[PDB]
From a paper:
The oral bacterium [name], a “keystone” pathogen of periodontitis, produces a dual domain [name] (PG0352). Biochemical analyses reveal that PG0352 can desialylate human serum and complement factors and thus protect bacteria from serum killing. Structural analyses show that PG0352 contains a N-terminal carbohydrate-binding module (CBM) and a C-terminal [name] domain that exhibits a canonical six-bladed β-propeller [name] fold with each blade composed of 3–4 antiparallel β-strands. Structural and functional analyses further demonstrate that the CBM binds to carbohydrates and serum glycoproteins.
To elucidate the catalytic mechanism of PG0352, we first determined its unliganded crystal structure using synchrotron radiation to 1.84Å in a monoclinic space group. The overall structure of PG0352 consists of two major domains encompassing 493 residues (31–523). We observed additional electron density within the active site pocket near the side chain of Tyr-488 that we subsequently modeled as a partially occupied citrate molecule derived from the crystallization cocktail (S4). Another carboxyethyl group interacts with the side chain of Arg-213, mimicking the interaction observed between this side chain and the O4 of sialic acid. The positions of the side chains of Tyr-488 and Glu-382 suggest that they serve as the nucleophile and the general base catalyst, respectively, as they occupy topologically equivalent positions in other structurally characterized bacterial [name] enzymes.
Residue numbers in the entry: 23 to 523
């Protein structure tokens, strides 16, 4: 019901549940939106709030931020693209007021905090606050609460690619690599004009860290899209046994538009200096499929792409990525084959078929030397579970491995890590929890000996999609995930006990 005796200002508020890390500045705890500007006759807005002792103990300062923009992420994540004023509050106070002139017509208010240096990082190590009152010239307004605040502390948490960064509207498709020397390489689709895939015009962008993810270089475009049907994306990364970094990606038309005579092409580029410089992209499509393929039985295949994220370099030195290949123009179906090189990338071959009606697939090395492959469930097949397969000949031949099944896949890319926990060999697997949607990015542990999956632990609640993972030299896990409906690519660091103990 809407009344007809004047204008009705409405107040909406959201508690924040993005992760945080020690020493971060101006982290949003609660956002408040007015439905309209303060009336011209207004003089002051007062905001009262609650903040428990445990959160107060973990912050060094509080602020009221005021912006003309209603932003999804912490305001410094937009690097000045969101303009805001910052009004300090003693961390002991529970109310604050601003003149209407200071507010200057703006509608969006952020209760924010500087995070202190300490944390235990346990599941219970979370920050919260609540806005309790919003009053204009002493008159309280009814508050519409849409979410509670709960920000979990992680050993590291940083949005590496945020919509607008560098002038790119959007970002998707995370890939992370740790080199033998400890360098971290983070790549992404720089989705410059919107969030859609090829044949849209897309670049590949990179950031590097030489201090374990504490700080990151300015983003660099390393492969520039040149127009619709001429973009590049879907990066996967390895480091070869010789030490060179190898990135594989696709470019051109979209997957379902690719044909044998006009393919969406697969390229590789290498770095011999920890990701500083990269070789001009080399087209390797002819090793895989299409009119230039020397295997006549693959010359009529239509499309191929390797799963974004990471490949796998075997102890022998064989370099592997799983391709998802379209063999027929009649159907929207893909089959998986391992794309591999035994000569440091000079030439490439295909395994026997690893999975029928597959999709983006990933490899990891079992403790006994076998290769485990994890296949995305496309089209809600069977019981909507993640699919698995095993190879005992270093990836040449495959058999379905139903014993690894037991986790739901809403239909999304994810990653695995082989880990040892309390003396047991286990596989960590990242996926959205769903169910049946891109929501709540989670990790699970599979115990090799019992054949049982753990309960999931949600790393990032809310909208969540592709994830990649790497082991850092000191045993911490780096988790690189698509957060939000308008995606930011976020790098989170934790140890397993932080999530499962």
């Amino acid at each position: 019901h809407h009344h007809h005796h004047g204008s009705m200002q409405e107040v909406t508020m959201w508690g924040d549940s993005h992760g945080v890390a020690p020493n971060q500045v101006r982290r949003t705890l609660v956002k408040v939106a007015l439905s309209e500007s303060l009336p011209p006759g207004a003089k002051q807005i007062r905001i009262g709030f609650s903040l428990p002792k445990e959160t107060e103990e973990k912050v060094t300062a509080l602020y009221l931020l005021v912006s003309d923009s209603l932003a999804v992420r912490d305001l410094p994540d937009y690097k000045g693209r969101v303009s805001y004023d910052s009004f300090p509050i003693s961390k002991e106070d529970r109310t604050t007021a601003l003149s209407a002139d200071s507010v200057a017509g703006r509608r969006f208010f952020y209760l924010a905090a500087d995070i202190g240096p300490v944390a235990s990082f346990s599941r219970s190590d979370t920050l919260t606050a609540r806005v309790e009152e919003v009053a204009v010239d002493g008159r309280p307004l009814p508050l519409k609460e849409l979410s509670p605040a709960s920000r979990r502390l992680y050993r590291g948490y940083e949005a590496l690619f945020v919509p607008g960064d560098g002038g790119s509207r959007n970002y998707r498709i995370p890939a992370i690599l740790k080199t033998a020397n400890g360098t971290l390489i983070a790549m992404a689709d720089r989705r410059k004009y919107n969030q859609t895939d090829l044949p849209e015009d897309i670049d590949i962008v990179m950031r590097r860290s030489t201090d374990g993810g504490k700080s990151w270089s300015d983003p660099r475009i390393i492969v520039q899209g040149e127009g619709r049907n001429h973009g590049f994306g879907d990066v996967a990364l390895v480091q070869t046994q010789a030490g060179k970094l190898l990135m594989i990606f696709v470019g051109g038309v979209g997957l379902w538009q690719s044909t044998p005579d006009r393919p969406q092409r697969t390229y590789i580029s290498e770095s011999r200096d920890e990701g500083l410089t990269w070789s001009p992209p080399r087209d390797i499509t002819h090793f895989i499929f299409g009119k230039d393929c020397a295997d006549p039985g693959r010359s009529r295949w239509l499309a191929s792409f390797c799963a974004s994220g990471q490949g796998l370099v075997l102890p022998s030195g064989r370099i592997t990525f799983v391709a998802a290949i379209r063999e027929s123009g009649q159907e929207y179906v893909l089959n998986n084959y391992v794309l591999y090189s035994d000569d440091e990338g000079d030439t490439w071959q295909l395994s026997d078929c690893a999975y029928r009606r597959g999709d983006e697939a990933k490899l990891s090395l079992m403790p006994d030397g076998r290769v485990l492959m994890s296949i995305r469930n496309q089209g809600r097949q069977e019981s909507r579970q993640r699919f698995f397969a095993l190879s005992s000949d270093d990836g040449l031949t495959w058999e379905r491995a139903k014993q690894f099944e037991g986790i739901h896949d809403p239909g999304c890319n994810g990653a695995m890590l082989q880990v040892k926990r309390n003396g047991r060999d286990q596989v960590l697997h990242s996926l959205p929890l769903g169910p049946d949607g891109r929501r709540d990015g989670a990790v699970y542990l599979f115990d090799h000996v019992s054949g049982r999956w753990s309960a999931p632990v949600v790393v990032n609640s809310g909208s969540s999609a592709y994830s990649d993972m790497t082991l850092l030299a000191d045993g911490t896990i780096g988790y690189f995930v698509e957060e939000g409906d308008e995606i930011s690519l976020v790098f989170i660091r934790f140890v397993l006990d932080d999530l499962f103990d």
